[PDB]
């Protein structure tokens, strides 16, 4: 007769049952208590400001009007019954396109206890905004959150809350970490109310703190950008009279540098302003075009005067490699101390 | 408490009549918008649209939902639309829309007492604008977003916004990487046809494009190669494998910079102002390179004729380029 | 520059309406955390309110149901509103600007700070 009884108690709950109320409906709020599980921390899109985040997503609350006594305690719904009672709205604030799994069938769970209790997971992944300030980049570090709550109910009738400590409600996985361009450092849990046209609402937040890692372009932006500079310098030392070897030497570093900075400039989004990488190449492009300058005029006062010829080329051969070298100081301290 | 409610809540949908508006055969039912922007990205040049996604809210009422004896607003499952009579609300300029369906379906209903009803709905869509881009970067573009109902007329329906200008929020807090809005317009009017009126509304977004970028990596770059191309005047014309070095890599450079910058901007293929600009720069390094031939070719027979011509290249070369610099800028700021 | 320059305060009579007011100048803050902070006579810097792009509120233990943070994002400011005021209240009150990384409730992560508000509660 077990199985007569298992079949009895799914037949009886829903007998009187409204599914367009709120449990505690004109009596009381009703309590949500959310964890998250998070997989996996996909890629993020600096060109959209996006981020990809696979969830396990859990939710619990109380409805007296599923009580039911039995030689069980727990109970599982098919996904047609499970349709058939009320479930909270949840919606992410920021996100933009999500999708809720259903291979090979859809991924959700719901139970019920005897007291009342529900337990609803599902298994989604989450297509979210991280707005990002870009102006040191690359040496730039950013928080992108994740916010959801209820797209319908006010919080005079629903509030949300954690299941344990804020800090322990939310768990990434040990290889969750699916970034290529960035380093996760950690999370911050927090919760807080937002107000719109309709009323007040409870919102729940997270955010991921994230570091960029900057070996990639020192290795293919800065230490070649850095060597053009020195080899533009390098012609101050060959002889005067060697028009067409300085002449040469200036104009094809230029050339060199022209490539450089088209290259970089691939990497970057199309923001407006100027990123660290920005003033850097515009200081090294500024270096070599002075070199040429240089040249020019030493060359124009050979002949005539070779005292003041000689005079300047002994002075650029320490002014260009001080001034540069004092750019970097300052540009390395700036930037890496922040 | 809740079993007064049920009770009252399945006796509204009792009789209900879904295919019949409110106000049947009487005066037009009112409907108030409301629209709250969430986020505006990516405007597209070559698609000439823009995506936008919001909270988009309806105000009406209707008698046959008036209920008395509670004290509240019913927020009821939003599966409870289907079940009632909503507007035939479209946009007129949209390409591709959904509604946002994580967890479920990001729709509400609420009632009140008197019988009005708030529907709401978070919608991202992506509507088309014409933009003209003759000025590109220097340019300004108009974008709207026009709402109309598809079957009915003035005689049934009428469209106000709700709040006045107020109607519209958020703006304010958009960030544009390459924009700047401006300011935003909201029209009512109806449209007469042949048929009679049709009510439709308009929200209309200004945008005013950053230069930054394009001033470190467009016009700096081409002005200071023009300048290199200088440095061959100050050149004695004996050398002439230091002459024609420098006048023919900087043609190079040139050309590089344009290949691929036409590589990284957006596909518009007809003339802009940016087009015309870097065209001016490569004549102009074109010219510098042509005059050491005239000279190279005279200079033994008639060596101090070349000399002037030398001399005065270094005065008209770098007037005619700041003339031009001068005419460009007036013409498109 | 930026400067975030402070407004408001004063004394009250342990009660009554105190609006702390905060503008910003030389940079927008739209896409930036705005947040007030509170430091009583010698014995910390404590969080109070903070409001994000979204609009979203932030309060600490504390304050909560007796401040209300808001933002006028047209003018650049951002407002808090002082209901309730006890002799305990009296400290100097900051505004403050930041991205929030590693948190926005820690005063560490800010990148602009105002220069102070006394406000005095007299009981």
């Known amino acids: 007769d077990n199985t007569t009884v298992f079949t009895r108690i799914l037949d009886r709950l829903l007998d009187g049952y409204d599914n367009r109320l709120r449990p505690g409906l004109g009596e009381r709020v009703t309590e949500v208590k959310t964890d998250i599980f998070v997989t996996s921390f996909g890629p993020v899109s600096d060109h959209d400001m996006e981020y990809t985040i696979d969830v396990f997503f859990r939710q619990s609350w109380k409805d007296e009007r599923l009580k039911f006594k039995g030689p069980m305690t727990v109970l599982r719904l098919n996904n047609l019954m499970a349709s058939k009672i009320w479930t909270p709205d949840t919606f992410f604030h920021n996100g933009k396109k999500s999708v809720a799994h259903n291979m090979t069938m859809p991924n959700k769970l719901l139970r019920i206890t005897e007291d009342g209790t529900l337990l609803y997971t599902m298994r989604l992944t989450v297509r979210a905004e991280c707005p990002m300030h870009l102006e040191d980049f690359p040496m730039d570090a950013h928080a992108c959150p994740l916010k959801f709550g209820s797209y319908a109910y006010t919080r005079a009738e629903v509030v949300y809350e954690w299941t344990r400590e804020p800090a322990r409600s939310v768990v990434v996985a040990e290889d969750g970490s699916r970034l290529n361009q960035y380093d996760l450092l950690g999370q911050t849990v927090d919760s807080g109310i937002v107000q719109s046209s309709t009323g007040e609402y409870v919102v729940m937040t997270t955010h991921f703190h994230l570091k960029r890692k900057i070996g990639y372009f020192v290795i293919q932006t800065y230490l070649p950008c850095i060597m053009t500079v020195i080899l533009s310098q390098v012609s101050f030392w060959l002889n005067r009279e060697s028009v067409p070897a300085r002449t040469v030497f200036g104009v094809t570093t230029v050339l060199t540098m022209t490539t450089l900075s088209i290259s970089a400039r691939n990497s970057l989004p199309k923001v407006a302003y100027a990123t660290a990488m920005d003033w850097f190449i515009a200081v090294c492009y500024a270096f070599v075009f002075s070199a040429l300058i240089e040249f020019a005029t030493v060359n124009y006062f050979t002949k005539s005067q070779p005292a003041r010829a000689a005079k300047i080329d002994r002075l650029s051969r320490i002014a260009f490699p001080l001034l540069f070298g004092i750019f970097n100081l300052v540009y390395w301290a700036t930037y890496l101390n922040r | 408490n809740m079993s007064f409610v049920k009770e009252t809540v399945d006796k509204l949908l009792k009789g209900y009549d879904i295919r019949l508006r409110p106000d049947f055969g009487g005066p037009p039912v009112c409907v108030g918008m409301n629209i709250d922007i969430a986020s505006i990205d990516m405007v597209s040049e070559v698609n000439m649209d823009y995506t936008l996604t919001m909270y988009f809210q309806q105000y009406w009422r209707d008698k046959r939902l008036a209920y008395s004896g509670i004290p509240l607003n019913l927020t009821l499952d939003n599966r409870v639309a289907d079940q009632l009579w909503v507007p035939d609300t479209y946009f007129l300029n949209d390409k591709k829309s959904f509604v946002h369906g994580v967890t479920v379906k990001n729709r509400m209903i609420r009632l009140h007492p008197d019988g009005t009803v708030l529907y709401g709905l978070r919608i991202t869509t992506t509507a088309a604008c014409m933009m003209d881009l003759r000025r590109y970067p220097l340019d300004e573009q108009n974008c709207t977003l026009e709402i109309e109902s598809y079957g009915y007329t003035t005689d049934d329906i009428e469209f106000y916004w709700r709040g006045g200008d107020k109607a519209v929020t958020g703006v304010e807090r958009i960030e544009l990487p390459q924009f700047s809005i401006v300011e935003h317009r909201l029209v009512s009017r109806n449209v007469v046809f042949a048929t009679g009126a049709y009510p439709r509304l308009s929200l209309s977004f200004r945008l005013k494009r950053n230069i930054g970028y394009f001033i470190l990596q467009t016009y700096m770059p081409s002005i200071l190669i023009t300048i290199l191309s200088w440095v061959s005047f100050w050149i004695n014309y004996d050398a002439s494998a230091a002459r024609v070095a420098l006048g023919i890599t900087t043609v190079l450079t040139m050309t590089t910079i344009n290949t691929h910058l036409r590589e990284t901007l957006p596909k518009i293929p007809y003339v802009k102002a940016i087009d015309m600009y870097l065209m001016g720069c490569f004549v102009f390094v074109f010219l510098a390179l042509l005059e050491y031939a005239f000279v190279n070719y005279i200079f033994f027979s008639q060596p101090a004729r070349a000399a002037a011509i030398d001399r005065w290249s270094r005065i008209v070369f770098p007037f005619t380029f700041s003339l031009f610099n001068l005419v460009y800028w007036l013409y498109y700021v | 520059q930026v400067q975030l320059q402070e407004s408001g305060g004063g004394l009250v009579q342990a009660g009554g309406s105190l609006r702390v007011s905060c503008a910003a100048s030389?940079?927008?803050?739209?896409?930036?955390?705005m947040a007030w902070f509170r430091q009583a006579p010698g014995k910390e810097r404590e969080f109070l309110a903070a409001?994000?792009?979204?609009?979203?509120?932030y309060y600490g233990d504390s304050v909560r149901g007796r401040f209300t943070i808001s933002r006028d994002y047209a003018k650049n400011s951002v407002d808090l509103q002082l209901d309730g005021l006890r002799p305990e209240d009296t400290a100097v009150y900051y505004c403050?600007?930041?991205?929030?990384?590693?948190?926005?409730?820690?005063?560490?992560?800010?990148?602009?700070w105002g220069q102070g508000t006394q406000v005095t509660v007299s009981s």
């Open positions: 030389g940079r927008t803050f739209t896409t930036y955390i």
């Open positions: 409001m994000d792009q979204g609009r979203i509120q």
């Open positions: 403050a600007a930041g991205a929030g990384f590693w948190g926005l409730r820690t005063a560490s992560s800010y990148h602009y």
